[model samples]
Each structure stands twice: as structure tokens, then as C-alpha cells.
Target: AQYEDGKQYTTLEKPVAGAPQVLEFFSFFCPHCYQFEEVLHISDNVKKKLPEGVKMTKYHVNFMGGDLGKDLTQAWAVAMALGVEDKVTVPLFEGVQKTQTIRSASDIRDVFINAGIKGEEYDAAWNSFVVKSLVAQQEKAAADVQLRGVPAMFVNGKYQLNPQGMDTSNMDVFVQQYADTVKYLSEK
Candidate 1:
């Protein structure tokens, strides 16, 4: 593999599970993270290119606190619990970044409902203790990784993908390298 360590990625002290897991840590309030949605198709393409048996997950960072990031973070947990994340993730990003229409839990909940999720389903998922617990777990996970920024990724919970080291002048190359790194690490 062409991607080298101590630069492009960092190896975690604790190894993850046997199955490959690609976890993306981001905040909805981060404009750059929202931009990744357009430049890299962050959600759709990442999932599409994952090799067989590899699973992709997105974690919301509420580092900013209050109405900025926490609302969206909890919203994501609800969407995930309702199994409508894939449908609402991009829209949520746009709602915050482009339209600036999402502010409270109800606003975020409406996004899921508009995505075809029933109101009852949305309420159950939004208020479920499982979502609450998962949100708490994600907060701990973000802190466990010592995350200080958005749009970071962990491959198999071991390697932290360093987009900062990439040549931003050519985003296509960076995207390919990111994909290749995931594939290589997954096989290992």
C-alpha cells in the first residue's frame, strides 16, 4: 500500500473487533465536514466502496455544545435508531449548512418524517432509551479517541485516517487514497 503511517494515519493503542469497521467522527455544525458531503460523497460513496463484510458508521460530535452541535448529534442518534440515517444524513447536513432550517429536536425529527419515516416511528426512535444510550456511547467514543476536530475517521477502531496530510490541491487523489487505505486495512 502506498499510504504510509505516522503521517496519513495513526494506529490506535487498542485494536478493534475481528470484523472491519469504518467509523467517521464529525459534527453537523462544521462547515468543512458538510463540504465533504459534496466533495467526497462522504456518506453514500464511502458505504458504496466498502468491501464485503465491512461496515461503515458515522458518529456525531457535540464538542461545540448547546444549539450548535448537540441538537444535531442527538438528532443523528434518533435517525440511526429509526434506521433512517442513510436517508436523512445528507438532508440534515443541508438543513444545517445550506438552509439553516434545523434548530431543535422537532426540526430534526421533521427531517426524518419528511424522509418517509412515520411520525410514530420517529417518536419511538427519538425518545427511545436505546438512542439515548447510543448517544452517550458516541460521546465517550469521541473522547476515547481524543478527537479535537470534525471529519475524522477510524478504520477498524485502530487507524485514524488523517485527511489533513492529504494534498488538498487534488481532492480526487485524496479520495482514492482514503478508499485504498480502508481496503488495505480491512484485509489486514
Candidate 2:
């Protein structure tokens, strides 16, 4: 499960921080992201194998620029701000990919509400200056980084893992390969 550093994943010209930054760039509407969550089991595997001092952040790609996409991104920004991202993350993905129930920001709010987050809490987080600013930053990042696609993994904002050519036939081996690549990059 060995991979060439520059070939498998290229390092970023600028580091996100002093520590290794593991950023997963994804979109809620992306089928591949759904597959990564359901089939590849990326988040759990990567988190479990992440070394100490490494920072893991999930950046929802602002690809859906129209009505639905913008609302979903806003919802994600609020979720991230309120620190309930983990709780509603899977449900949001499932709602979009499986149930097709999440159609707007209001729909997303319902998902949070059902998860036990009070209305005031949701409203506060949704309208907070920080949340709005973060959402704007994500918009800028999507264009600045020239993100080619969803389910893109970046380390320290320098190196990007290319999963395009990888095999997904055997779940275990595929996950191992990804984990190994991530481990190798974190060492650098």
C-alpha cells in the first residue's frame, strides 16, 4: 500500500497551519461523497488513523451555486458553527442522497431540529456573523483553490490526494490504500 509522495498526492505551496491539515473537500449533493460515506467509510477510517498533531477539517464544497446548493452550504456553515456538524452530517447526506427530503435551508433546519437542536440555537448559529463569514470564506476558497471535484482530500492545503484512479472493488483494500496514503503524507 505504498504511494509516491508527489505522484499520489501533491503538497500545497502554502500550509493551512503549522500542523498537518487534513481537509476533506466535499459537497452534500455529490453522489461520490455519498459513496465515500456509505461504501468507502472515509471519515471514520481517516479519523482513526490520523496521527497526533494533525488537524482534520471537512470543507463542504460550494459547488451548488444556485438555490438549493447555496442553502445547503449555509446550513453546513451553521452546523459547523454550532458544533453539531457530526450529529447532522450523516443525516444530511442521507436525506439528500437516499430520502431526497432535504431540498432547502428550511429542510436542513428541520433535520437539526429533529436532532434536538432548539429553534433559537439554530437561528443563532444560522444568522451569526461568524457563520456568515465562514460561509463567505468557503465561497472564496472554492474559487481560489479551483477545486476540480468533490471528495477531494487535501493535506496542509498543499498536497491533494488523487483518488480518481484508485480501485474501489474491494472495500477493505481500498480503505487501507487510502489510509496508507494519508499516513504517509502525515509523516511528512
Candidate 3:
């Protein structure tokens, strides 16, 4: 796949306030993004080995799914707003994947509740300016960038598609490659 620079898509902006910003563009339902999570978590280990000023963040993209899938965008927005990115994102991923029972809005609300976000708090967070700003920002990013897929990893807003167009079966390899590439770029 080829990405045309300046043809923006639904991704988080980079060049963070600090040096070495890593932004991952992913989706809740995307199998690749889901499978890649554990490997990407290695960044936390890499963080301990790194110098200061590196920032890593995940931006959940939702432009390619049906109504239920698209609802995840809103859920993520709320989680980000509530300052519960750490609390909710992983569980949401697991919930989407493993819950044998079909999920409903209440099911998600329960997840938030389980994560210690009260129902009222979650409700207010969804409407808060911070999350709303991020929601709007990501929406514009998607449109401005013309993104067509999920799990698009970028370092400081520079895109990287592993092996330069070679298709691969192992997502962990790609994810680790992306992480290592970010590690290299950040050091440089």
C-alpha cells in the first residue's frame, strides 16, 4: 500500500510536545490491532531503557465498520475523556473478542463501571470538552489524511508500512518492527 503525504487520514497528530512521539492508529474490531497489543506493550519495557521525553499514544479509528463497530469510536472517546485510556482500552479489546454473550451498550457501560468509572462519571466524561476535542480532532485527522485501514502505526507523524508492501501473516513481527523502527527514529 502507498500513502501520499499531506493527504491526511483519520490518525492522531504527532510531533508531540516532547521528542519521540509514537502514535498508533488502530480499531477496536481490527484483528491485527487486537493481536498486536501485547507486543506493542513492549514499549513500556523499552521506556525503562530510554531517555526521557518519549511519548507513546494510541488513537482508535472507527471509519470502516458497521453501527456496532462504529459505536466503539464513541466509547473510546469517552474513555479518553475520562482519563481512562489505560483503564478501558485493553478491557474493551478483550470484551469485544471474548465475551460469549452478545454485547450491548449496557455491557460496555458495565465495563466502565468495572473499571471504576461510575455511570454518572462516564456519562459526563462523554460530553466533556477534553474528550470531545479529541473526538473532533481524530475525525478531522481521518478525513484530512484519507486513511483506509486500521493499525497504521506512525512515529512523530511519519508513516511506516513494514517491508514496503510485502504481505505477511505474522502481525507481531510487523508490530515489533514498527516499535523497533520508532525506537530507532526516536534515538536518532
Candidate 4:
């Protein structure tokens, strides 16, 4: 796969000490982000291909669904704090996209409830300093960057892989080229 560096990724002004961290900025409300993960298998496909010792961080944006966007970010952080994103992320996507079942924060709480997280457990995470800090960090990070769109991928916290017109058509090609770009920037 060939990629024009400037076109495919914006090099960050400051690097993350070369820790090989991948930052995925997305919103549960974003159809494209949903499509990428739901259909294109972003975590399943790209993460394993990352260099050894690399860690991927998923951030739900705070500017997409208005106040609800903020709420979703909180919900995301709550899951992270509780260690239940595996239980909530995809269902959150399905709720926003297909079921249209998530309209408010309580609706988000319901998803957690359905995930077998006790209401008190969910509330505990929501009130925890860790979850609060995470929400603030995500909101500030996405806001400060002023990203053009979600489903954005950043490698080493500095280089952002552009999710544009290219990539993700043929399933076979998408899996290779999409992951390859991340690999290219990750090692660079």
C-alpha cells in the first residue's frame, strides 16, 4: 500500500515518547465510526497487526451528539473505568444506529444494566475520579484537536491516520491497506 505522508497522516508536533500508543477518536453517534468498527473490524483487524508492546486507546468524542455527545463520552468513560467496553461499545453503536434505543443518559445506563453491570457498579464508576478524569481528557483532547471527523486514528499520539475516501471498499483490500497505513505510521 502506498500512502502520501502529508495526505494520509498529520505528524504530531510532540511525540508520545515512542510508546507505540494508538489513539482512536470516535463517537458512538458516528455512523462512519460505527461502520468502521461494526463492519470493517477495526479493533479485531488493526490492533493485532500493531507492533509488539503497542497499546490502543479508544476515545469517544464529546462534540457529536450535542449534550448527548457529552453524555456518551461519560458513558464511554464509565465503561472504561468499570472495564466493560467490551460489553458496551458495540451495543452502544447498535442502539444509536439500528435500534434507536439510546436517546438519553439513562438509556445509556440501561445498556450497562443489560451488560450485567449492577446499577450501583455503573454509578460507582460514573462517580469515580478515574472516569471523571477520563471524560475530561477525552473532551479536551478532541476539542483541542478540532478533528474534521471521527473514526480518526492517531499513532504514537502524534501521527493521525486519515480516514478518507480511500480504504474500506473491498473487505480484503480494506483489511490490508487500512491496517498497513497504521503499521507504516506506527513504525515511522
| lDDT, candidates in the order shown | 0.77, 0.78, 0.63, 0.80
Writing each residue's lDDT as its tens digit, candidate 2 over 1-188 gives: 45764556766565554433777878888988988887788977887898665578777776653677778888888887888987898899988888999877788899999988999999988888999897987776666577768888877666788776568788888787788788777667
> Stretches of candidate 4 above 4 Å error?
12-20, 165-168
Give model 3 RMSD, 1 decimal. 5.6
* Candidate numbers, best lDDT first, in rank order: 4, 2, 1, 3
Please identify which of the two predictions, 1 or 2, would achieve the higher TM-score against the true structure.
2
Candidate that beats the other on TM-score, 1 or 4, i.e. the better one: 4
Error of 4 at 53 (Å): 2.8
Give a tens-digit lDDT track for model 4, residues 1-188.
Answer: 45675766677676545333777888888988887887788876787787666688888987688988889998899988888889888899998889999998899999999989999988888888998899988876776567658888888767877666455558768666778888888777
Candidate 1 residue 87 Cα shift, in angstroms, is 1.7
Q: What is candidate 1's CA lDDT for residue 74?
A: 78
**CA shift of 98, model 3, Å:** 1.8
The collision pairs in model 4 are: none
lDDT tens readout by residue for model 1, 1-188: 46678767878787655523888888877887877776677656566667555678788998864675887777788877777777887888888888989877788878888899999987877678998998997888887767888888888778887777777777777777777766666665
Error of 4 at 123 (Å): 1.1
- Clashes (N, CA, C under 3 Å) per candidate: 0, 5, 9, 0
TM-score of each: 0.86, 0.88, 0.73, 0.90
Runs with alpha carbons beyond 4 Å of true place in candidate 3: 1-20, 39-50, 100-102, 163-176
Error of 1 at 175 (Å): 1.0
